[PDB]
Amino acid sequence: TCPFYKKIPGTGFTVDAFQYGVVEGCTAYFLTHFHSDHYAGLSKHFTFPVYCSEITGNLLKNKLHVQEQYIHPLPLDTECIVNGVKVVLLDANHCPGAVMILFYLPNGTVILHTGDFRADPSMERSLLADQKVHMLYLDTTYCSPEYTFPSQQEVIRFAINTAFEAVTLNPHALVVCGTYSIGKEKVFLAIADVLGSKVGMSQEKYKTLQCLNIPEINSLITTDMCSSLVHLLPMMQINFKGLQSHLKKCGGKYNQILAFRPTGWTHSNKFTRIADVIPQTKGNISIYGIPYSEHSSYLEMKRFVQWLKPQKIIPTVNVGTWKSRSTMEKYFREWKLEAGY
Ligand code: NI
Numbered sequence: 001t002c003p004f005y006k007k008i009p010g011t012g013f014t015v016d017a018f019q020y021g022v023v024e025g026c027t028a029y030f031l032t033h034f035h036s037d038h039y040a041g042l043s044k045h046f047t048f049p050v051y052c053s054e055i056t057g058n059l060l061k062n063k064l065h066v067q068e069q070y071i072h073p074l075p076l077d078t079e080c081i082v083n084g085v086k087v088v089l090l091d092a093n094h095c096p097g098a099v100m101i102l103f104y105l106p107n108g109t110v111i112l113h114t115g116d117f118r119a120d121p122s123m124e125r126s127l128l129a130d131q132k133v134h135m136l137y138l139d140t141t142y143c144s145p146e147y148t149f150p151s152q153q154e155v156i157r158f159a160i161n162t163a164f165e166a167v168t169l170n171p172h173a174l175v176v177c178g179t180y181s182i183g184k185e186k187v188f189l190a191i192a193d194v195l196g197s198k199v200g201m202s203q204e205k206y207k208t209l210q211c212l213n214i215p216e217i218n219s220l221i222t223t224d225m226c227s228s229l230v231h232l233l234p235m236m237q238i239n240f241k242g243l244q245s246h247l248k249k250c251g252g253k254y255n256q257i258l259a260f261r262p263t264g265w266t267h268s269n270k271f272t273r274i275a276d277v278i279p280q281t282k283g284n285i286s287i288y289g290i291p292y293s294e295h296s297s298y299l300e301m302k303r304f305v306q307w308l309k310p311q312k313i314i315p316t317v318n319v320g321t322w323k324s325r326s327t328m329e330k331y332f333r334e335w336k337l338e339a340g341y
Contacts, residue, residue, distance in 0.1 A: 002026075005137065005314050008113070010105050011085055015113050015137070016316075018042045028083055032115025033098030034059040035181055042066060051082060053089060055097025058211035059182075077127065088127055092117040094294045095183035096212045102127065112308070113137040114316075119296040119304035128308070136310040140317045141295040143328050147265055149293045150274045156190050158274050159260060159290060163191045166258045166286075167229065173256035175230040176246070178238035182208060183294050184262045189220060191260075192230040200228030225250065235261065240282045247285070257285045262292040302335055309341040 006017040012027030018041035023029075031052040032038060042050070044065040049072050052060070057073040060066040074080050076089050076099065085103065092098040094116040103111040110133045117139050163175050175195065177188040192199045199221050201209075206223050214220070222228055233246065238261045247257055269291055279286040296304065305313070313332050318324040 003319075005316055005319065008103055008111060010107060010109070011103065012083065013085070013103070015101065016115070018046070022048075030101060030113075031056055031060075032101065032113070033092065033095055034063075035095065035116065035183075038115070039064070046070060053097045053099050055212055056099075058213075059097065059208070062211055063208065090123075090126055090128070093120050093123075094118060095181070096185065096214075097182075102133075109134050111135045111137065112310075114139045116141075116294070117296060118294055119300040121303075123304060124307055133308055134311045136305070136308060136313050138301075138305070138313050138315055139295060140301075140315040140328055142265065142293075142298055143301060143315070143318070143331060145298050146270065147298045148269060149265060149291045149297055152186070152292060154274050155290055155292050156186060158277065159187060159288075160190055160194045162288065163230075163258065164194050166256075167195055170256050172254050173258055174247070174250065174254040176238070176243065176257055176259040177230065177232055178235040178259065178261045179205065179232050180235045182212070184292050185209070185212075185214075187260060187262050187290070187292055188230060188232060192220065195229055197229040198222045198227070199230045199232060200225040201232040205232055226253065229254075238287060240285055240287075243285045243287070255284065259285070259287045260290055261287060262290050264293060264295070265291060302331075305332075306335055306339040309339065 002014065002017050002020045002023045006015050008015065012025055013030060014023055014026050015030045016032055016038040017023060017029065018039060029048055029050050031050055034056050042064055044067065046066055047070060050060065050070055051072045051074060053076065054073040057071045060071055061068060074089050076091060080087055088102040089099040090102065092100050092115050098115060100115055100117060101113045105111065110131060112133050114137060167173050167175065175191055188199050201221065201223065203223055206221060209217065209221055225231060238259050243257045243259055247254065277288065279288045315328055
């Protein structure tokens with residue numbers, strides 16, 4: 001049965017709420033982005049209206065085989081009406097096609113649902129600036145002060161310099177990037193760009209990238225592994241076994257692998273600057289752990305919330321346990337007392 005935090009009060013609307021069968025009273029199902037925990041339950045068998053970004057709709061059509069009649073894509077940054085309610089979709093700075101949703105309720109209440117997001121200062125000069133927001137449905141993935149991480153740009157610069165040096169040193173080395181969902185594409189696109197290469201990958205992965213409205217994408221990606229010095233593999237294969245095995249498959253065309261594993265936070269973020277990072281190595285294979293986050297750090301989340309000054313916060317992540325809920329309520333209370341709302 002559908003939880004309160006996926007319901008929008010005073011509408012027939014739900015968010016990211018497809019795994020409970022038919023939700024009684026729901027007249028429109030929003031989907032914030034194409035990640036499986038959020039789309040869970042959607043299939044070609046779904047026959048109610050789904051509202052989402054154009055990218056998310058392309059994915060729904062092509063990967064999930066949801067029928068076109070049920071897919072209602074909306075442009076971003078544009079005031080639209082849905083079932084007689086005014087709504088706006090905003091860029092979430094998460095994965096391709098991910099959005100936050102602004103609901104302007106008939107009674108005059110304004111609600112922001114962040115979906116999944118990485119808070120940024122640019123969000124402070126959006127349509128959010130134009131009026132008070134009363135309720136915030138918040139991505140609390142890293143809502144604890146230990147969660148720090150570098151900027152996406154620091155990480156990319158690091159990846160670029162590292163790959164360029166290794167391949168200029170050994171022109172027969174192969175660059176491999178690990179992947180499991182959409183998101184974090186800039187890792188492999190920036191590396192490929194500095195090496196003058198396309199990125200090679202499986203047919204299933206190519207098909208996914210072809211739905212994302214990336215400019216000039218046909219000149220950036222290919223299913224011909226032979227013709228490419230940056231390859232994508234499933235994240236599960238980024239280990240010394242998987243990478244040796246892959247190296248055998250390429251027909252001796254390369255004699256070395258340099259691999260990247262973009263992770264979230266893991267415990268060593270507590271000490272190490274990006275400049276100090278060093279790989280695990282076994283022989284002619286070297287693996288780098290890089291902390292590329294598409295969720296807010298604790299400090300990013302705190303700044304956004306203290307700017308927005310909402311009357312109520314409703315978490316959407318880590319809600320299944322009392323300890324978690326209680327911990328998060330303590331931070332929200334500190335933030336409020338500090339900022340004076
Ligand atoms: Ni997500």
